[PDB]
Paper text:
Here we describe the prototype crystal structures of the bacterial Group III CPN from [name] (Ch-CPN), an extremely thermophilic, carbon monoxide utilizing bacterium isolated from a hot spring in Eastern Russia. Like Group II CPNs, Ch-CPN is a hexadecamer consisting of a doublet of octameric rings, its subunits interact between the rings in a direct rather than staggered subunit to subunit fashion, and achieve cavity closure independent of co-chaperones. The closed state with a non-hydrolyzable ATP analog and the open state with ADP represent the conformational states of Ch-CPN before and after ATP hydrolysis, respectively.
The crystal structure of Ch-CPN in complex with AMPPNP, an ATP analog, revealed its closed conformation. Eight subunits (from S1 to S8) assemble into a hemisphere-like complex with ~ 73 Å in height and ~ 160 Å in diameter. Two octameric hemispheres are stacked in a back-to-back manner to form a hexadecameric sphere with apical domains gathering around the two poles and equatorial domains at the equator. The stacking is mediated only by equatorial domains in such a way that each equatorial domain in one hemisphere has only one contacting partner - the S1 equatorial domain in one hemisphere directly interacts only with the S1′ equatorial domain in the opposite hemisphere. First, an inter-subunit β-sheet is constructed by the stem loop in the S1 equatorial domain and the N-/C-terminal strands in the S2 equatorial domain. The β- and γ-phosphates are hydrogen bonded to Asp87, Thr89, and Thr91 in a conserved P-loop motif characterized by the sequence GDGTTT29. A magnesium ion whose source seems to be the mother liquor is coordinated by the three phosphates and Asp87, which contributes to neutralization of the negative charge of phosphates. In the closed form of Ch-CPN, eight α10 helices from each subunit are located side-by-side with no overlap at the center of the ring to close the chamber.
Numbering used by the authors:
A (entry chain B), B (entry chain A), C (entry chain B): 10 to 502
The structure:
Amino acid sequence: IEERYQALFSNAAAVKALTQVVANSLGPKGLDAMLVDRFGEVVVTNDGVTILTLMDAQHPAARMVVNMARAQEREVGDGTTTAAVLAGALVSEGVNQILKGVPVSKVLAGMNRALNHALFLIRKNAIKVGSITDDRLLAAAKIAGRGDERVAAILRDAAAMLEDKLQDPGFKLADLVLAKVGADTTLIPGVVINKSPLWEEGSQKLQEVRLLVLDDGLYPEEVEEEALASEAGFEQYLKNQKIFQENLKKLKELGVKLILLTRGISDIAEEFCYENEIMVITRITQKELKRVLEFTGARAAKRTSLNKPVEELQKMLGYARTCFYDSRLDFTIIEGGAGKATATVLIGAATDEVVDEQERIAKDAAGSFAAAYRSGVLPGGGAFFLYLSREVESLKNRLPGMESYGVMAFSEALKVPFRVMAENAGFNGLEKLGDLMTLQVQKNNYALGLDFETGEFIDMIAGGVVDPAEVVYQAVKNASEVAISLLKINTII
Amino acid sequence: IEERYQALFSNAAAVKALTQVVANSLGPKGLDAMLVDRFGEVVVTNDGVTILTLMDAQHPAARMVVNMARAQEREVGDGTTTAAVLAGALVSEGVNQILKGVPVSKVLAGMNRALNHALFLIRKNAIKVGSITDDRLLAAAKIAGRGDERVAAILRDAAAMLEDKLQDPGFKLADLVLAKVGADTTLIPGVVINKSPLWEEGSQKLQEVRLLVLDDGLYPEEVEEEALASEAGFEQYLKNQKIFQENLKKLKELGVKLILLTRGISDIAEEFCYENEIMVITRITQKELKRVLEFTGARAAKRTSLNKPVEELQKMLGYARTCFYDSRLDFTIIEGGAGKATATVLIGAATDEVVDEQERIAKDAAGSFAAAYRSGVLPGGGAFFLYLSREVESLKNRLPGMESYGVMAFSEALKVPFRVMAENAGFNGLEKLGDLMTLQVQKNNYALGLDFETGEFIDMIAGGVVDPAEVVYQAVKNASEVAISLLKINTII
Amino acid sequence: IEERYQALFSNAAAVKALTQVVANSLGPKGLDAMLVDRFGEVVVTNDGVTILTLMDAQHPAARMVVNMARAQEREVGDGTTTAAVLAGALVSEGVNQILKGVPVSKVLAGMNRALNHALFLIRKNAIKVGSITDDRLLAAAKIAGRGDERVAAILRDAAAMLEDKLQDPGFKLADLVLAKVGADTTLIPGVVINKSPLWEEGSQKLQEVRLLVLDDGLYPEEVEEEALASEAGFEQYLKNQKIFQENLKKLKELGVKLILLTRGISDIAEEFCYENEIMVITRITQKELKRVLEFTGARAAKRTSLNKPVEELQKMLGYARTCFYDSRLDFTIIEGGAGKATATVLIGAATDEVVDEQERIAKDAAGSFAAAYRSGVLPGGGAFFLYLSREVESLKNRLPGMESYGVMAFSEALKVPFRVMAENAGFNGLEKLGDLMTLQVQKNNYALGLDFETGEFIDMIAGGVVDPAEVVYQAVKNASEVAISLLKINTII
Ligand SMILES: Nc1ncnc2c1ncn2[C@@H]1O[C@H](COP(=O)(O)OP(=O)(O)NP(=O)(O)O)[C@@H](O)[C@H]1O
Ligand SMILES: Nc1ncnc2c1ncn2[C@@H]1O[C@H](COP(=O)(O)OP(=O)(O)NP(=O)(O)O)[C@@H](O)[C@H]1O
Ligand SMILES: Nc1ncnc2c1ncn2[C@@H]1O[C@H](COP(=O)(O)OP(=O)(O)NP(=O)(O)O)[C@@H](O)[C@H]1O
Ligand SMILES: [Mg+2]
Ligand SMILES: [Mg+2]
Ligand SMILES: [Mg+2]
């Protein structure tokens, strides 16, 4: 039952230890981390929420910041490490002010006012985009993709085929990513079924594919096992074994050349498909189901649906221009669908470790693209944080009293992300920080930032280094929620 | 939770320990290794990915390298030991550069640049093949086959019968290999069922074989057990017990003399076959099924398929010129199929251990054959790597900065496989290295290498010592990818 | 029984771990280290040989480098950390060359030639001093004193009172240092007895002190306890109790006002001294004895010496102008002695920890002063090492063959001390290293070094930053002896 100041200590320390760890991954010069499970498994990543999640972090405070990261990821998908470092800074500063005797009440008030002002400036200064072709969107994607231009171009190009889906606040663009070992990273103008067909004789290409999709399995209508002791029961078994074979005949009459199922397939049916040139894939994902349904313009059927007359069934079929089973990667690719258009961002690499990290990078980039398209952009490099820092310090006195301390803490904490990245890039973090602030004021350009390889100060938006607006809004908001939440803590059980 | 430089050590150390072990297997003068199971089993091999797999690899880094090896094996099937050694070299070199104070970031940048240049040069210089007969294909097969010209001739001859199949990026030539103790290494122009027939009276030869093959078992159409309490149910048990017998008569009328099944056989049928001299094999592999299907031109049937008219059944039969059951080796050989032609590369030896290793060698040779046919060849003996080192060191200058160090590390690392193979062959590795590099430049022949037997420098391509191109590309790509990914690691949990 | 390469590893690693630790203490921006004994004791220091000595370092290699440091300290007293870092560099480089396949023989040869050339250049380029007043001597003292100018001035000033003693290769100037808690650091133109007198009535000052010094105790000539059973024995006891009291009377007649003893004092004598105004100090060090003997011009006596006639005794007395017992610090100070002149460099601080570290600094400075006075000076900052580095790399080919590698290693290792200090000063170590080397060649001034606070390149000798020549000679020589000694190692038991 730790209490008093030795609660606030026990907390703050617990957070520092956490943030220190991911601090090394923040930025373009950030380094990776290697994690192993309690009993032998291994991941390597630069992703923040990943690192923070996989260490089983035992202190409650640490677990809370981890949850904050999770939240940040859920909201936008990037800016996790930023949120962590920022949170840590906020907390440490808050503690510092509190130890010097500043009332918690006041620290929290100042921090809140600061927060609201900050978010205000962030929403206000967001520079919005009109296109999807705008180089600022692709730039956002590149920065989030950690410098991969190929991937950024791929995602822009896919989003282009969508856009409408971006209008729904529930469409995660990264859902389009699909990772496959031994693949080559590329854009597929169709959907992928990541499974081998029921019968394979090597790689295979299909053209003018009329397909039938089932959220069922291709079995006859069943008769409960008990009921088979009852003549009529059995006669029903026979009857709908007959109507079943008739239905398969319907399938051939309609010219079906592909069948996808979410369940299994009868032996009789399997034979029918083999003899009549029909390809089958079983056990498809629900996700896969939805996407192929949309793309091919097919309607989802159950076994009973095959009892429709043939004229009514042709209406449930879908169409794809081509369809290709890759014997080397063991999946199937449907392209040229008669329904909505869509894409699959295929991410390839040699080994599991690498394709995993590349998928994470991909999804980061996708989310940040979408986030940019939805919310506009801002100058990256952490500069806009510095703008926010002086603007927040502006508020130091607009309410006089001890809330000032609180405000200062917030301002000072906003200085930290940048400093870290500069330190990560081998520079004198503090020096570059100060210099850049002075310069920002003197040329009045709050978009001036640091080029981390060359070491020269540049114009960030000019340099193609932009962050999505919502990523910053969300990062600051979440980091703030957790830090303020922790600072109000006085006792532990 | 080890961090900082003392992560980079524990990683690097863990890797050297691994690579050292397989280094002695690299080359034509490389030596073998012996491995034992947790509870009594034994392997002997010169193969890299195998040794690396069977080892107790506990460290995360080592496990990552094993995984890389696995990837290299998946991709091309040869060149694993090379990839391991190269990877290790890259890592140690990188560590050294980082220790003299080069920023990790810069090292990795330089290495990436080097990598890309290397791959470019590798692809550019690939020497293409235009025939399945080219003496360079057989050369590749010989070298990968560790000097065995018998096997190489067999694979050339076998690959020849296909050609149509190699065109599929999913066709593993090595899938043709089959190992049998007490056999003699030979080319079989058919497919083998590695099983004894259901009824054997000693070795037996069949000619003019009309055969029927089933992805089922030869049983009557079943009736669920419960339903038998229901008159109609039983009456149909009877009815399609009669229909089964008449179907067998159909088999006799068609003159079927061989039956292959992936499931079992009813006793009634087994008697039918005994009395009408029809040979039967049960429980065949999926491989065996697909192969015999393609080769005999038969169509796969299920029990229900025997209900067609006799005239219709005659269409799914297949035909083989001859068919021979070997009582000594206890398998069956189908030759002269009316379908596509194919081959079985039979690999024989006295003991389990040896035929296992000879099989590994065979598959390696097949894979390098196919890969040569697909991607061309390059000068082996480790020479082309020296050319690439000489070429990569070039960039040190063409881009200024500290990336140079990184590039140097890459350059210096490509030097290692050769030096290892030379030391393994009992030469002064460093001397031969220097001499050979100097010479390579002076005669401008980027293909001069060391004959590890004679000790004289020869032209490797003229000397018939060639590596498949894709094997080199994949090896460099993979070793690089893993080393770079490990060097970016800064912390371990 | 570790053997082969895994001896050379086990060694090299063991050394790295050691050197890393003291590397942080090297330089003007070096930081301190805290050590605790197996059972609760504590030291804080920047001294190298101290840090290295106090960790109980378990690996044989580590223990050897520690011994090397000890040696360096014995020889000159400064340059310990330099020697350690240099040794480490030499070893790591040597290992690197050896792993690439360079014959140990050759590495060692190259390193030796390099060593001899280096020492040659060091002896050749030593810039000698003529004075003792030369600002280059005081500069040497300041640099060694870690920037304390007060102390440097003190030591120069004392050495001035000696100089003759410096002519003997056996006089350690640092022997003049005396550390006292609660004292004030100052030069005393006399000698100090660090003990309280036999009888104290508070602080006390004596003038015109005629003193008697005894390497004995003031007791009568003894009679063995057995002998006291023998009349004549006892009569001898009486007799030389009588002649003893007479001798004390001689002591008063001669006007003795102070007596120093290395042993004890009789009760009768103690009374005699109390009643006749005579101060006594008992149990003085041998060191203290020698110094006060020299300074006061007294001759050492034993009890029997008091049997001389008075006229002959006056000849054994010594004289001091003044003599002062400080009741606050509890020691005694003799000044204005009629013998040789001498000094006591009194080092004061508040606490044990601090006065200890300050004594270490003092002795460092004293030794480096003396070393400068005896052997001349060189440009510090590690620059002269860089001169030596290019000069050593000069030798790379003057013998062609693989010794070249060895030579290079030596050269490259000489680059390391500087780099470390630059890294310690928060700079980019590698960058500053390279820049400075280029500049050194371009302005041809091999005395150009780095100002570690300002960050600008300056002329070192001009900047007052000089090392004693012998400190460098010794550092390089010793570091080399141990590194070469370790590299010849192939097996461990
Ligand atoms: N080339 C660049 N120049 C300057 N800043 C950059 C550059 N690339 C990325 N950044 C900045 O790096 C930060 C993002 O680093 P990153 O490693 O993604 O942390 P994070 O995105 O906050 N957490 P996460 O991406 O989920 O791992 C942002 O502040 C970017 O502005
Ligand atoms: N006769 C030869 N002369 C010179 N080099 C040869 C000769 N035979 C093979 N090599 C080289 O030896 C290497 C093959 O060694 P090997 O032991 O197969 O390693 P690996 O093939 O890379 N790994 P793995 O085959 O999976 O066990 C290649 O670099 C060949 O170029
Ligand atoms: N102001 C300075 N500017 C430049 N170099 C300096 C300065 N002060 C000291 N040095 C260098 O610092 C080194 C000595 O550092 P130091 O910490 O004494 O290590 P060390 O003397 O080799 N071992 P030790 O002195 O026994 O602890 C020498 O190379 C000096 O040239
Ligand atoms: Mg990011
Ligand atoms: Mg091979
Ligand atoms: Mg010193």
